[PDB]
Write a protein that binds this ligand. Structure first.
Ligand SMILES: C[S@@+](CC[C@H](N)C(=O)[O-])C[C@H]1O[C@@H](n2cnc3c(N)ncnc32)[C@H](O)[C@@H]1O
Length: 234
């Protein structure tokens, strides 16, 4: 995943003196990437098991200035106007209330502070929408929703956040490995496979469905993007 991550560093326009907050931080890859360039990274993740991974991994790469902690995006501990940068990467489709999360991002971000949000997203067409969302709840039962770009813009505007699409790009997925990494049972996998085999034309177009002649999926694409948001006023 080095591309999404590099873009954020290019787009973030770091400063020696900045403080960074990585939300849904995971094994903490974003949080570490930033570390050489900013003062301090803080990262939150909901699962405690992930805080530990993150924090030991930090230690393993011996970086002093990043630290992880447990919490949720819908309720960040931190004070208002207390970060220059916030990163959120392939985590939002997991939040149980993305509306609130943005509101919190808004709160805790400083004025003219930047929100670098990377994720994949539903196309505007609701039918294509369901398609890509249903393909992912099937793979990952923890998948809440990948909101659409209209939706992201409406949320940004709703929170005095100035929306800019830095760059889109298709996310190739190699079906076979995607399944492994995701741990899915062969029950669900059969539903995934039916799903991909009965794709509308529009669907197998928009998501690059490539299949073995036996119906067995080779590959497809998610729609990745990097929105950047900047806290202005209302
Ligand atoms: C798939 S990981 C994303 C990868 C990671 N953020 C990175 O940049 O490398 C999604 C993360 O979201 C966390 N998560 C799920 N719901 C959350 C929530 N409501 N608030 C904060 N984190 C959440 C999970 O623990 C998980 O680590």
């Amino acid at each position: 995943h080095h591309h999404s991550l590099g873009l954020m560093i290019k787009t973030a326009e770091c400063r020696a003196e900045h403080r960074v907050l990585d939300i849904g931080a995971g094994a903490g890859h974003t949080a570490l990437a930033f570390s050489p360039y900013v003062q301090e990274c803080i990262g939150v993740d909901a699962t405690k098991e992930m805080v530990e991974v993150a924090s030991s991994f930090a230690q393993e790469k011996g970086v002093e200035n990043v630290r992880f902690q447990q919490g949720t995006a819908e309720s960040l501990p931190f004070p208002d106007d207390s970060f220059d940068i916030i990163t959120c990467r392939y985590a939002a489709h997991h939040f149980s209330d993305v509306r609130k999360a943005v509101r919190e991002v808004a709160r805790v971000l400083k004025q003219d502070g930047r929100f670098l949000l990377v994720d994949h997203y539903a196309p505007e067409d609701p039918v294509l929408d369901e398609f890509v969302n249903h393909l992912n709840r099937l793979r990952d039962p923890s998948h809440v929703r990948e909101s659409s770009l209209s939706e992201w813009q409406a949320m940004f505007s709703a929170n005095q956040l100035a929306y800019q699409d830095i760059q889109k790009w298709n996310l190739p997925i190699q079906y076979d490995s995607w399944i492994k990494r995701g741990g899915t049972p062969a029950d669900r996998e059969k539903q995934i496979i039916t799903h991909l085999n009965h794709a509308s034309d529009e669907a197998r177009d928009t998501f690059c469905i490539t299949l073995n002649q036996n119906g067995q999926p080779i590959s497809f694409c998610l729609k990745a993007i990097l929105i950047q948001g900047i806290k202005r006023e209302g």
